[PDB]
RNA sequence: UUAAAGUUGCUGCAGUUAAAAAGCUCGUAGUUGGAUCUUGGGAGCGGCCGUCCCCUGCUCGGCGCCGGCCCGAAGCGUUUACUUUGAAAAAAUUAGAGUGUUCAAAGCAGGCCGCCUGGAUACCGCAGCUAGGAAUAAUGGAAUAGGACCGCGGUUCUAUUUUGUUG
C-alpha cells in the first residue's frame, strides 16, 4: 500500500529508528503522525491525523505553506494522479453594451488523498501556495458536497 | 535595465517634495539611508526650498561641508541624505533645532523646537528579534538596532530613545485611547485617538481613529505611529494640530484673515 | 400552444374555489386509501384510479380529503411502479410506431412522428434524470425499448 | 411564453388608458405589481384598485382616471447607481417638473426622489408620467 | 382539569371558569362520549367595539375537526350558559419567523404568517365557509379585505359579523368585512 | 481621421411592394424563464403625519447594579450578484481653489513698513479588500427520514488543586 516506488517514502520530521524496550509488541508498530494547523479558520480533519500516506505536497502533513489568495471552484476531471482540475465561472462586464458576458478558465490544483469522498461537481475551496509543478499553484483545503447526495 | 538606477526625474518624484516644473530635468535622488525613497526629505531640498539659506546646489554643498548640519546628534556631510519622520536637524552656528513633522496636508513642515526637546526621538518598533546567544534584539522604523530591550516591548508599540547615548528611556503601549499619528496614504499627518482595531488574518489589519471634533477615519496598521499616552502627546505639535479642516473653513478663515489684515 | 403541433388548445380542468370537504360525502380518508390500494392491486395507473374514484365513489380529489396525492400514497405504501407512467406510455407508443415501420418503409410521416415521439421521450427523460427519479446510467434506445414493456 | 408579468400589466394598462376605458383587468398579479400600483396611487395617477383573490394567482381590477399618459417597463433590470440616475432622468423623462422612475432598492420599491432622499440605488423597473 | 396549557404556568380565572363550565356540561349531558379526549388549550376575553364582548377558545390542531364535528351544539350551549356574549373557536398555531442572512430545519409553509392568518380566518366562522375574498386598498395605502360567505346557513351567523371583525382585528391586526352575495348561489 | 451618420442603430436602424425571414421541421451549446414564505404597531414630538428607540444567541471581563444580573468581548453564524461607505489607488495631463506674468496662452508664485503665507480638492473604468440593507434574480434543508431537540447504556488513547516525604 505504501512504498510502491523505487525509493523509500518517509516523513523527514519523525525518526522511526529509535531504540525500544523489547522491539516487539505492546508499545510499538504505531508511527507518530506529524501534522499542523494551516490557519485562517481551516480545521485539520481527523483522517490526516489517523492516516498512513506520506506526501510532501499535502497542506497539512507536508512542507507546504499556505498564503495569499483563497479561491473556489467546481470539480471537473479526476484522471491524473493526486492533481485535479477545477472550473471557475465569473461575469465579465462590457462598458459599451450595458450587459454581461460570462467566461470560464480552468486551473489544476493538487489533491491530497485525505479527501476521498469527492466526486465531479463538488464545491471546493483552494488556497494559494508555492509552485509545486509547471501549472499547479493551489491546494485543496476543504470540500463541500454538491446538490442532493442524500445517500 | 542592467543594474540599479542612479537618476531621478523632476516629474517622476514624490509630490511632497513640492518642486517646480521648469528649472531642470533631474531631481535630487536621495542617497541610501535609514528611510525609504518616497517618505523622506533630502538635506538639499530642505535647506534650499524650506529654509531658503542657500540659492543653488553648490551653496548648500558648501554649507554641508563646513560641518554645520547635525542629524540625530551626528554630523552628516551627505548632500542627499534622507531625513525622514521625526529626524532632528540641529544648526550649531545659527542656534535652532527642527523636527520633521507632517502637517494637516501631505507634506513636511518647518517646526522649530526647544533644545531640551531636541535631545530625544520617538520611533516605532518593527519586529522582535532574538540574537545568537539568546540575546533579544529590537528593530525600529529608522533601522536602529537596539540590544537588550524591555520584555514588554511588542511589535506595534513605540519607544523614546536618547540621542547622545542610544538607549531606551520609556515606552508607550499600543492600545485603544492612545493618541496616534497617521503616516502614509490619503490620511497623512492627522492627529487622533485610537478607538478600534479590526483583525484580518492573512491580510492587512485596519484601525479606526477618531479626531478631536468627532471626525473619524481609517488606515492600515502599518500607517499608525503612536505619539502619546492617552490624550497627551509627548512632543510639541505644529500649528493646526493635524485637524484636517476641509476647504470651506479654510476659505472662511482666509477671508477672515484678509479682512482683519487688509 | 402545443410543443410539437401548430394548434392551440384550451381544454383543461377548472377546479372550484372551495377546497373543503362537502357535507354529503360519507367517506373517511382511510376508506378511500383502502379503495386506492384495492385498485392498485387490480393493476391501474393513478390517473385511472382518480377517474374511477371521481366517477363512482363521489369524491372530488383525494388531496382535498387526504393530505397526500394518489402517487404519494402509492409511494408511501410501496407498490408504485418503478417507471413514470407518461414516459412508459411514450415508450409504448414509440414501440408501436417502430413496429409499424418494420413492415412499411414508405411511410415518411410515421417516421417524422417517430422522431417527434423520441424527442419528447428524451426531453422527459432529461427532466426525470435531473429530478433523480431515473438512474443516471439510464438511456432510451431501440433494443432497450423492446425488453421494457 | 409569458416571461415579464409587469411589462404585460403596464402594457394592458397603457392600452386601456389610450382606449379610454375606466376599468382594467390584469389577470396575473405579483407583489411587484402591487408595489408599482401603490406608488402610482400615492403619486395620484391611478385610482382605487382591487385584488381578486383566487387560489392560483390573483387578478387585479384598477379603477382608472384620465391622468395617465404612458406606463413603460425597462427590460431587463439594469443596475443603476446614484450617479447614473440623472442619465436616466434626461433620456427617459419628458420633463423635469414631473415624471417618475420606479426602481427596486433594498429599502423597497420606490420612486427616484425617495431614492435620492434615502441615499441609495438599485435595479430599474419602469417609468410613468 | 380540562386545561392543557403548553407551558406549565397558572391558568387564568376566566379560563378556569370556562373549563369548569365545559366539564360540568359534559357531565350533565350526553356529549361525554365525544368529549373524553377533547381538551381546551387556552382562552381569552377581549372587548368588541361597542356594548358586547366575545369569548375566544383555543383548540389544538390534531383535535380541531373533533370540535368541528360538534361545533353546532356547543356554541348555543355556551350562549345559554352565558348571558349574551358570543363565542368563537380558533385553533392554536405556532408562527415561525422569516429566516434572514444575519441569523437548522427548513420552515414549513403551513407555519407561515399568511397561511396561519388564512387558516384562522377560515376557522373563525364554521357554519358559513368562505366562497371568495376581495382586497380593497384605499387611497392611504391601507388594506381592507371583504369576505363573501355562502348563502346556506346565513341567519345563524348573520348577527356575528361585528364580533368576527373585532376578534380578527384583535388576533391578526387588519380590518375585515363580511358580505353575503346573491350572484351565484 | 472625427462629428454631421437614427447611412453599423446598447441608448438608437430596417426585412409585403424601395437592399433584406433559411422550403419546412426536430434538436445540443447559448440566451430568456409563472405565482407564492413577516405583516403591523408601541413609547413620542408639533398641528393623521416629513424626523427619533424597538420588534440573532450559548467562555473571560468591569463599564455598572444586587457569587448572581447586565453590557462589552476569545469563538461562530447558508452561500452570491446588486447597492452605499472606507482603505490603498505615481507624477504630468482633465476639471478646478488662490494669485494683476501690463492681459492671455503660461507659471507656482508672491504681499505687507524682518513678518505672513500658499504650493488645495475631485475624477481615476473592470478585477482585489472591508463594513451596514435584504427589495430584485439563481441556488439548499426533512419523504426509503441515520429529520431537530431532550435527558439515560458502552468500545479507545490522556490533563497533578487532591490518594503521608519515596518504585
From Swiss-Prot, chain A:
Gene Ontology biological process terms, A to Z: translation
PROSITE patterns according to UniProt: RIBOSOMAL_S17
A GO molecular function held by the record: structural constituent of ribosome
Subcellular localization, as worded in the UniProt entry: Cytoplasm; Nucleus, Nucleolus
Keywords: Acetylation, Citrullination, Cytoplasm, Lipoprotein, Methylation, Nucleus, Palmitate, Phosphoprotein, Ribonucleoprotein, Ribosomal protein, RNA-binding, rRNA-binding
Modification Citrulline, positions: 20
CDD domains assigned: Ribosomal_uS17
Xref: InterPro entries: NA-bd_OB-fold (IPR012340), Ribosomal_uS17 (IPR000266), Ribosomal_uS17_arc/euk (IPR028333), Ribosomal_uS17_CS (IPR019979), Ribosomal_uS17_N (IPR032440)
PTM: Citrullinated by PADI4.
Modified residues (Omega-N-methylarginine): 67
Modified residues (Phosphoserine): 65, 108
Modified residue annotations for N6-acetyllysine: 36, 43, 56
Cell inner membrane among keywords: no
Chain residues carrying a lipid of type S-palmitoyl cysteine: 58
GO cellular component, one term: cytosolic small ribosomal subunit
SUPFAM superfamilies (alphabetical): Nucleic acid-binding proteins
Listed Pfam families: Ribosomal_S17, Ribosomal_S17_N
Keyword Ribonucleoprotein: yes
SUBUNIT field: Component of the small ribosomal subunit. Part of the small subunit (SSU) processome, composed of more than 70 proteins and the RNA chaperone small nucleolar RNA (snoRNA) U3.
Family: Belongs to the universal ribosomal protein uS17 family.
Annotated PANTHER family: 40S RIBOSOMAL PROTEIN S11 FAMILY MEMBER, SMALL RIBOSOMAL SUBUNIT PROTEIN US17
Name of the protein in question: Small ribosomal subunit protein uS17
Annotated source species: Oryctolagus cuniculus (Rabbit)
Gene: RPS11
Curated annotation (Swiss-Prot), chain B:
Pfam families in the record: 40S_S4_C (PF16121), KOW (PF00467), Ribosomal_S4e (PF00900), RS4NT (PF08071)
GO cellular component: cytosolic ribosome; cytosolic small ribosomal subunit; nucleolus
Keyword rRNA-binding: yes
GO biological process: translation
Keyword list, A-Z: Acetylation, Cytoplasm, Isopeptide bond, Nucleus, Ribonucleoprotein, Ribosomal protein, RNA-binding, rRNA-binding, Ubl conjugation
UniProt keyword annotation of Nucleotide-binding present: no
Residue numbers carrying N6-acetyllysine: 232
Highest rank taxon of the organism: Eukaryota
SMART domains membership: S4 (SM00363)
PROSITE patterns given in the database record: RIBOSOMAL_S4E, S4
GO molecular function: rRNA binding; structural constituent of ribosome
Matches recorded under InterPro entries: KOW, Rib_uL2_dom2, Ribosomal_eS4, Ribosomal_eS4_C, Ribosomal_eS4_central_region, Ribosomal_eS4_central_sf, Ribosomal_eS4_KOW, Ribosomal_eS4_N
Reported function: Component of the small ribosomal subunit. The ribosome is a large ribonucleoprotein complex responsible for the synthesis of proteins in the cell. Part of the small subunit (SSU) processome, first precursor of the small eukaryotic ribosomal subunit. During the assembly of the SSU processome in the nucleolus, many ribosome biogenesis factors, an RNA chaperone and ribosomal proteins associate with the nascent pre-rRNA and work in concert to generate RNA folding, modifications, rearrangements and cleavage as well as targeted degradation of pre-ribosomal RNA by the RNA exosome.
Recorded family membership: Belongs to the eukaryotic ribosomal protein eS4 family.
Name this protein carries in UniProt: Small ribosomal subunit protein eS4
From Swiss-Prot, chain C:
A Gene Ontology cellular-component term: cytosolic ribosome
Phosphoserine, modified sites: 29
Keyword tRNA-binding: no
Segments forming a coiled coil: none
N6-succinyllysine sites (modified residues): 26, 33
N6-acetyllysine PTM sites in chain numbering: 26
Positions of crosslink type Glycyl lysine isopeptide (Lys-Gly) (interchain with G-Cter in ubiquitin): 26
Subcellular location: Cytoplasm; Nucleus, Nucleolus
Pfam families assigned to the protein according to its UniProt record, in alphabetical order: Ribosomal_S13_N, Ribosomal_S15
Cross-link (Glycyl lysine isopeptide (Lys-Gly) (interchain with G-Cter in SUMO2)): 42
GO biological process, one term: translation
Residues bearing PTM Phosphotyrosine: 37
InterPro entries: Ribosomal_uS15, Ribosomal_uS15_arc_euk, Ribosomal_uS15_N, uS15_NS1_RNA-bd_sf
Alphabetical UniProt keywords: Acetylation, Cytoplasm, Isopeptide bond, Nucleus, Phosphoprotein, Ribonucleoprotein, Ribosomal protein, Ubl conjugation
Subunit structure, interactors included: Component of the small ribosomal subunit. Part of the small subunit (SSU) processome, composed of more than 70 proteins and the RNA chaperone small nucleolar RNA (snoRNA) U3.
Similarity field: Belongs to the universal ribosomal protein uS15 family.
Listed PANTHER family: RIBOSOMAL PROTEIN S15P/S13E, SMALL RIBOSOMAL SUBUNIT PROTEIN US15
Purpose of the protein: Component of the small ribosomal subunit. The ribosome is a large ribonucleoprotein complex responsible for the synthesis of proteins in the cell. Part of the small subunit (SSU) processome, first precursor of the small eukaryotic ribosomal subunit. During the assembly of the SSU processome in the nucleolus, many ribosome biogenesis factors, an RNA chaperone and ribosomal proteins associate with the nascent pre-rRNA and work in concert to generate RNA folding, modifications, rearrangements and cleavage as well as targeted degradation of pre-ribosomal RNA by the RNA exosome.
Name of the protein in its database record: Small ribosomal subunit protein uS15
Organism: Oryctolagus cuniculus (Rabbit)
UniProtKB/Swiss-Prot annotation, chain D:
The keyword Cytoplasm appears for this protein: yes
Keyword Ribonucleoprotein listed: yes
Subcellular location(s) per record: Cytoplasm; Nucleus, Nucleolus
Membrane-spanning segments: none
Record-level Gene Ontology MF annotations: structural constituent of ribosome
Record keywords: Cytoplasm, Nucleus, Ribonucleoprotein, Ribosomal protein
HAMAP family the record matches: Ribosomal_uS8_A
Membership in a protein family: Belongs to the universal ribosomal protein uS8 family.
PANTHER family: 40S RIBOSOMAL PROTEIN S15A
Quaternary structure, from the entry: Component of the 40S ribosomal subunit. Part of the small subunit (SSU) processome, composed of more than 70 proteins and the RNA chaperone small nucleolar RNA (snoRNA) U3.
Name of the protein in question: Small ribosomal subunit protein uS8
Taxon lineage: Eukaryota, Metazoa, Chordata, Craniata, Vertebrata
Gene: RPS15A
Amino acid at each position: 500500500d505504501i512504498q510502491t516506488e523505487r525509493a523509500y517514502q518517509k516523513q523527514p520530521t519523525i525518526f522511526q529508528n529509535k531504540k525500544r524496550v523489547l522491539l516487539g509488541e505492546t508499545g510499538k508498530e504505531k508511527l507518530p503522525r506529524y501534522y499542523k494547523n494551516i490557519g485562517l479558520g481551516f480545521k485539520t480533519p481527523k483522517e490526516a491525523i489517523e492516516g498512513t500516506y506520506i506526501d510532501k505536497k499535502c497542506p497539512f502533513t507536508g512542507n507546504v505553506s499556505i498564503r495569499g489568495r483563497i479561491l473556489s471552484g467546481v470539480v471537473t476531471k479526476m484522471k491524473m494522479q493526486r492533481t485535479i482540475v477545477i472550473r471557475r465561472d465569473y461575469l465579465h462586464y462590457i462598458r459599451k453594451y450595458n450587459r454581461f458576458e460570462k467566461r470560464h478558465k480552468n486551473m489544476s490544483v493538487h489533491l491530497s488523498p485525505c479527501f476521498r469522498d469527492v466526486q465531479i461537481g463538488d464545491i471546493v475551496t483552494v488556497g494559494e501556495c508555492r509552485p509545486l509543478s509547471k501549472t499547479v499553484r493551489f491546494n485543496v483545503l476543504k470540500v463541500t458536497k454538491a446538490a442532493g447526495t442524500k445517500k | 535595465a542592467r543594474g540599479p538606477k542612479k537618476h531621478l526625474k523632476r516629474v517622476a518624484a514624490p509630490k511632497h517634495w513640492m518642486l517646480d516644473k521648469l528649472t531642470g530635468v533631474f531631481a535630487p535622488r536621495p542617497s541610501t539611508g535609514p528611510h525609504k525613497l518616497r517618505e523622506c526629505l533630502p538635506l538639499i531640498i530642505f535647506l534650499r526650498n524650506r529654509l531658503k539659506y542657500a540659492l543653488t546646489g553648490d551653496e548648500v554643498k558648501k554649507i554641508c561641508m563646513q560641518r554645520f548640519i547635525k542629524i540625530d546628534g551626528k554630523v552628516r556631510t551627505d548632500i542627499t541624505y534622507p531625513a525622514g519622520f521625526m529626524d532632528v536637524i540641529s544648526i550649531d552656528k545659527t542656534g535652532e533645532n527642527f523636527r520633521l513633522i507632517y502637517d494637516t496636508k501631505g507634506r513636511f513642515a518647518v517646526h522649530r523646537i526647544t533644545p531640551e526637546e531636541a535631545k530625544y526621538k520617538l520611533c516605532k518598533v518593527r519586529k522582535i528579534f532574538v540574537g545568537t546567544k539568546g540575546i533579544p534584539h529590537l528593530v525600529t522604523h529608522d533601522a536602529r538596532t537596539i540590544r537588550y530591550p524591555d520584555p514588554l516591548i511588542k511589535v506595534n508599540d513605540t519607544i523614546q530613545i536618547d540621542l547622545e547615548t542610544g538607549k531606551i528611556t520609556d515606552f508607550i503601549k499600543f492600545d485603544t485611547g492612545n493618541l496616534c499619528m497617521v503616516t502614509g496614504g490619503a490620511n497623512l499627518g492627522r492627529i487622533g485617538v485610537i478607538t478600534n482595531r479590526e483583525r484580518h488574518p492573512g491580510s492587512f489589519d485596519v484601525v479606526h481613529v477618531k479626531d478631536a471634533n468627532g471626525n473619524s477615519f481609517a488606515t492600515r496598521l502599518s500607517n499608525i505611529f503612536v505619539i502619546g499616552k492617552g490624550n497627551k502627546p509627548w512632543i510639541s505639535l505644529p500649528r493646526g494640530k493635524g485637524i484636517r479642516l476641509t476647504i470651506a473653513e479654510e476659505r472662511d478663515k482666509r477671508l477672515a484673515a484678509k479682512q482683519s489684515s487688509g | 400552444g402545443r410543443m410539437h403541433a401548430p394548434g392551440k388548445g384550451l381544454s383543461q380542468s377548472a377546479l372550484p374555489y372551495r377546497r373543503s370537504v362537502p357535507t354529503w360525502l360519507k367517506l373517511t380518508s382511510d376508506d378511500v386509501k383502502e379503495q386506492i390500494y384495492k385498485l392498485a392491486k387490480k393493476g391501474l395507473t393513478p390517473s385511472q384510479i382518480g377517474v374511477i374514484l371521481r366517477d363512482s365513489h363521489g369524491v372530488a380529489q383525494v388531496r382535498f380529503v387526504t393530505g397526500n396525492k394518489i402517487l404519494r400514497i402509492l409511494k408511501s405504501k410501496g407498490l408504485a411502479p418503478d417507471l413514470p407512467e407518461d414516459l412508459y406510455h411514450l415508450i409504448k407508443k414509440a414501440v408501436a410506431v417502430r413496429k409499424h415501420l418494420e413492415r412499411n418503409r414508405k411511410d415518411k410521416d410515421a417516421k417524422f412522428r417517430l422522431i417527434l415521439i423520441e424527442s419528447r421521450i428524451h426531453r422527459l427523460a432529461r427532466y426525470y434524470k435531473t429530478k433523480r427519479v431515473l438512474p443516471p446510467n439510464w438511456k432510451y434506445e431501440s433494443s432497450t425499448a423492446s425488453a421494457l414493456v | 411564453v409569458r416571461m415579464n408579468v409587469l411589462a404585460d400589466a403596464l402594457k394592458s394598462i397603457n392600452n386601456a388608458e389610450k382606449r379610454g376605458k375606466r376599468q382594467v383587468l390584469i389577470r396575473p398579479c405579483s407583489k411587484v405589481i402591487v408595489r408599482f400600483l401603490t406608488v402610482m396611487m400615492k403619486h395620484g395617477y391611478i385610482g382605487e384598485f382591487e385584488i381578486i383573490d383566487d387560489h392560483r394567482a390573483g387578478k387585479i381590477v384598477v379603477n382608472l382616471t384620465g391622468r395617465l399618459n404612458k406606463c413603460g417597463v425597462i427590460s431587463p433590470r439594469f443596475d443603476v447607481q446614484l450617479k447614473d440616475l440623472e442619465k436616466w432622468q434626461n433620456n427617459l423623462l419628458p420633463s423635469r417638473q414631473f415624471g417618475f422612475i420606479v426602481l427596486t432598492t433594498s429599502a423597497g420599491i420606490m420612486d427616484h426622489e425617495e431614492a435620492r432622499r434615502k441615499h441609495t440605488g438599485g435595479k430599474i423597473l419602469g417609468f410613468f408620467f | 382539569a380540562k386545561i392543557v396549557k403548553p407551558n406549565g404556568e397558572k391558568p387564568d380565572e376566566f379560563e378556569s371558569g370556562i373549563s369548569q363550565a365545559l366539564l360540568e356540561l359534559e357531565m350533565n349531558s350526553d356529549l361525554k362520549a365525544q368529549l373524553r379526549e377533547l381538551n381546551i388549550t387556552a382562552a381569552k376575553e377581549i372587548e368588541v367595539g361597542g356594548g358586547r364582548k366575545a369569548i375566544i377558545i383555543f383548540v389544538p390542531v390534531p383535535q380541531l375537526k373533533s370540535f368541528q364535528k360538534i361545533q353546532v351544539r356547543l356554541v348555543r350551549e355556551l350562549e345559554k350558559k352565558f348571558s349574551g356574549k358570543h363565542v368563537v373557536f380558533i385553533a392554536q398555531r405556532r408562527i415561525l419567523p422569516k429566516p434572514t442572512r444575519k441569523s437548522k430545519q427548513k420552515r414549513p409553509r403551513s407555519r407561515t404568517l399568511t397561511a396561519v392568518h388564512d387558516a384562522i380566518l377560515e376557522d373563525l366562522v364554521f357554519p358559513s365557509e368562505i366562497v371568495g375574498k376581495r382586497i380593497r386598498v384605499k387611497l392611504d395605502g391601507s388594506r381592507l379585505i371583504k369576505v363573501h360567505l355562502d348563502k346556506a346557513q346565513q341567519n345563524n351567523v348573520e348577527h356575528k359579523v361585528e364580533t368576527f371583525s373585532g376578534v380578527y382585528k384583535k388576533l391578526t391586526g387588519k380590518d375585515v368585512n363580511f358580505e353575503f352575495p346573491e350572484f351565484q348561489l
